[PDB]
Design a protein around this ligand. Structure first.
Ligand code: CA
Length: 201
């Protein structure tokens, strides 16, 4: 057996701080036999799960001819916002890896994926009442920003663009709010969830 096994797994997965996740990689091989103990979710220069992503776990089973690699874990509430490149590596019974040790040392490889760590914002319990829901005043925008800050205590200055919560949380004129994180990724909160018209009944 000199044919490498082949992993099928998305090229990008999104996970959220404070939440658990689970994604299934499947692998096939001409021999239908695997060395199950030599399965790794790894980075390019080690078989460990990599610096900053030590919380990535794996569970490996085989169902008939199909190797099933469960990529799972719980993202820490205080891990860094950003993304990483990691790899699902499998080994057939004959010792052939899906990716060679030379390829890792040096183009997307089999089993390669980007894992993006995101923050999911909590909505405030109550909306802010505003005079004109399409022309918020600066005071009303500040009140919306403070409502978001209050409901999102684990969103810290280090997590956002410019290390400044007051400028990274940008409230538009109709209350729709964009948060820009330290990796320049975004979260958009609809204004209908944040503001209501004063005396609108
Ligand atoms: Ca093989």
């Amino acid at each position: 057996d000199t044919e490498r096994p082949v992993v099928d797994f998305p090229g990008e997965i999104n996970v959220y701080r404070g939440e658990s996740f689970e994604f299934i990689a499947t692998a096939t091989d001409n021999s239908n036999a695997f060395d199950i103990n030599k399965t790794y979710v790894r980075w390019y220069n080690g078989t460990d799960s990599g610096r900053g992503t030590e919380w990535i776990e794996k569970t490996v089973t085989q169902e008939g001819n199909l190797l099933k690699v469960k990529v799972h874990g719980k993202v820490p509430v205080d891990t860094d916002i950003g993304h990483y490149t990691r790899y699902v590596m499998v080994t057939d019974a004959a010792g052939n890896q899906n990716v060679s040790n030379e390829e890792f040392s040096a183009r997307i490889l089999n089993g390669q994926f980007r894992i993006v760590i995101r923050y999911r914002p909590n909505l405030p319990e109550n909306t802010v009442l505003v005079n004109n829901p399409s022309q918020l005043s600066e005071t009303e925008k500040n009140q919306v920003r403070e409502a978001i800050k209050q409901s999102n205590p684990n969103l810290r200055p280090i997590d956002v663009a410019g290390k400044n919560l007051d400028t990274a949380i940008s409230v538009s004129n109709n209350g729709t709010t964009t948060i820009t994180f330290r990796d320049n990724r975004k979260a958009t909160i609809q204004g209908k969830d944040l503001v209501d018209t004063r005396a609108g009944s």
